[PDB]
Structure formats: C-alpha cells, structure tokens
Amino acid sequence: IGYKLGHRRALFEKRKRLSDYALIFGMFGIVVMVIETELSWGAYDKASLYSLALKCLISLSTIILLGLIIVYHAREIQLFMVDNGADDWRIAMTYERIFFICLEILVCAIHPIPGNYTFTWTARLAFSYAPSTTTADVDIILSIPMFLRLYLIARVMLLHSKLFTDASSRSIGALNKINFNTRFVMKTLMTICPGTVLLVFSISLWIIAAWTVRACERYHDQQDVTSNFLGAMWLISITFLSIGYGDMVPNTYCGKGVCLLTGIMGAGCTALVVAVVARKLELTKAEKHVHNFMMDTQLTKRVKNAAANVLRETWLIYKNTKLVKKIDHAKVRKHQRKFLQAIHQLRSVKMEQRKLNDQAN
C-alpha cells in the first residue's frame, strides 16, 4: 500500500533526525566541561563569573538534551504502534521498556550545577604510605560520569547504517528473518574491517583514560608525577600492555579503577589484534599455486644433481681401487666418505619432495 509504506518512511526519517541533535548537545556539554575543568585550576577560581556562565551553558544544554530524548522515545513508541497493528499506546509499555528510559534520563541528567561546594578528601600516598588531606570541590565528582554520554554515537551509527536504511537490504533480510539490531551491525563491521575498529577504540580509550587519570590525580600530587599528561599517557600504555606500573602507582582510587579497566580491556584487545595480524600474513590461492610450482621445479633440479653426484663418487671409487696399480688409501677413504654424504643428501631431498607433494593435497 502506498500510504502504509510512505508513513513508515516518514517516521524513520523523523527518528533519524532527532538522533543527531542529541549527539551534538551531548558533545557540546562534554567539551565545555573539559574546558571549564582545565581553566578552573590556574586561570580563575571557583568564585568568579566565568565558571557561573559555563555551568549555566552546561545546564541549558542538558535540559535541551533531555527534551530531545523524550521526543525521540515518543516517536519510537509511535513507530512500534504502527509496526504491530496496535491502536493503543498503553500496550507498548512494559517493565523492560520503562526501565531503560529512566536509565537514560538518569545517565544524561548528571552534570556540574552552578554554585560553590567543597568537601574533605583524604588519601594514602604510594611508596611512602604517608597521609594526605585536602579540600576539594564537588564538581569533580559530577563531571567524570559525563563520559557515559558516548552511547549516542552507537545509536547514530546504527540509524545511519547502509544496511539499516536500504530497501533491498530489508527486503532480502525479511525473507531470511534477520533481526536488524545494533549487534548485527557491530558483527558486520568486525567481519569487514576489524583493525580499523580496534585502532579507533584503542586511541579513544587511551586519550580519555589518560585525561581522567590526570584529573583525579591533580589534587594529591605535589611532585609532577601522575598529574603530568605525558606520564599519564605512558602509564596507560604500559598498563594496557600489562608490563607493570614502574613508579607511577596512583595515590587515588579513581586512578586505580581506571588502571583496572584499562588492563581488563587490554587483556582481550591484545589477543584480537594478534589474531588479526596473524591472519593478515597468509598467502592467497594463486600465490600458493605459483610458489608450489617453483618449489617443485627447484626440488626436481636438486634431486637430479644429487643422483648424478652419487654415480660420480661410485665411479671414482671403482677407478681408484682397481684401475690404478698402487692404491692410495687416503683417496679411496675420502671418496667413500663423499659417497655416503651424497647418499644422505639424495634421500633427504627425496623426503622433502615427497613431503611437499603430500602437503600440496
């Protein structure tokens, strides 16, 4: 039917459009938070007006993002109603569906609110076991969880997927009853180009984790060890590869948790990358055929050479032992040694030829 297919396409585009705005308004807030955190350490203090303005901008972006999420979920419920022949929206409200909306709202609602709030922080230093106490601001607690807003990139990639938005792809998949969920696209990407995915994921995790470690280690490091950015990069790299900590053990449980997560991720990433590299070094069918042809040629030549050498040595022994009148025993002994060596070489090359012929099967 013309209307029925046209109605579905309109809702698909409307749902696709709303996903880009959410990503924009999440990334804007993340970038502003990073800038505020960096500039509130040495440029200005937490009682000035720049912090107030930046946090007001963050709050406004958060409000807009929450509204966009609500509208997106309303449109998705409309699509569900269309796709199942249901004329009441209350049928779509299950316990599983309600929980995820609340989880999304809770994740996207956390941000540093304007104001001036402080608390007391106590830590135990590394390699010296000395106590350390300082007064810190609350906004560091509320800004680290803001990185959870990165789940919107997966949604945007799924809604912009070529397979997800192709009439022929859907038509073929319907015949085979294939669910076009977010897991199918990830598996397809892993089958197509695993190395690119692994590299991008590793670089993004590296940068984000190093910045987070530096941010947590600012407060208790008075010696420029774990608050250095290059030092944090090196520490994350050596924890990812599981070489050790050196003298870069954090004095904070935030750094310890980030290091544990980095090690857990690296444990699997290393194996996956190694498997991909091992697969990349194999030959193809035509290359294997050409290589086998050439190897057979050289093996035939060497077999012929060894066979000739054996007969040469035999004739030399016979000549030196009978035709010559006075027998030089050194010569005949040398020729017998060479005869045995030639026999061994001949049988070795024959064995190699047989092994290659068997392997070619």
Partner: protein, 146 residues
C-alpha cells in the same frame, strides 16, 4: 507519504533482484533461485502458495504493484495472521489441517499455563460450530476479524 519518486526507485532496484529477465514478472523459478542462494530448498508446493498469497489476478504473476503488497507484510515485525498459523501446525499433523476436539481439550489443559475446564468447554462449543468433531483450525480467520 505517497511514495515519492526516489522511494519508488529504491523498490525498483529491489524488484530487479528477483526479476533477472527484466520482462516485468517474477516466476516460481526466479523466486526459488534467490531462496536457494540464502540456504533454503523449498519445494514447488511451498513456492506456489507464496505467489497466490499476494497474486490478485490469479495468473501466477507478481508485478510491481503486487510486489509492494508483499513487502508491507514482510517488513512488519509481527503478523497476527502468520503467527497463529505456526501455532496450530505444531500440533497439526497429516498435512490436512484438521484437529479433533479430543486433542484440543487435552493440550489446552495440560500444556502451558493451562486453561480451565469450563473455559475450554465454552471454547470448544464456539470452535466446534459445525459439530462434526473435526475442527479445521481455520477458525482464526473469523476470530481475529472481530
């Protein structure tokens, strides 16, 4: 919502996948060839019931207007018509499509969440309108209509 030209072009490209000859009709062998590449080996009896399900002219021909109707049911997540088909054929053997009232009462009181004796008695009474005992399971055609 009126299937603009670009949207029709996408369905035109999809239609050419089955319609290899380019004449404008999809035959049983044309449809069967595609399904064989996907890992299925249906019989001609299975193939025949798919064309006439969508065919409206009764000539074994699937043109472009009919191809759109087939897609609409396929893109749907759940089809109440087809799901009820699969439920009966689980208990329907002999390929005849008839279920006796003896087995129908047994399955609905021992398997699953289990109904109650007065409920199945009312259900059988509504199901066995003919009264012959052989309840052809096509009653859902009028059951889901209301």
């Amino acid at each position: 919502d009126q299937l603009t030209e670009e949207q029709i072009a996408e369905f035109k490209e999809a239609f050419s996948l089955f319609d290899k000859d380019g004449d404008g009709t999809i035959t049983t062998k044309e449809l069967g060839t595609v399904m064989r590449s996907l890992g299925q080996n249906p019989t001609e009896a299975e193939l025949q019931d798919m064309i006439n399900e969508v065919d409206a002219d009764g000539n074994g021909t699937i043109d472009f207007p009919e191809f759109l109707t087939m897609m609409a049911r396929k893109m749907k997540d759940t089809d109440s018509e087809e799901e009820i088909r699969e439920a009966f054929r689980v208990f329907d053997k002999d390929g005849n499509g008839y279920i006796s009232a003896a087995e129908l009462r047994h399955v609905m009181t021992n398997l699953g969440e289990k109904l109650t004796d007065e409920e199945v008695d009312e259900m059988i009474r509504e199901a066995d309108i003919d009264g012959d005992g052989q309840v052809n399971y096509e009653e859902f055609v009028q059951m889901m209509t209301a």
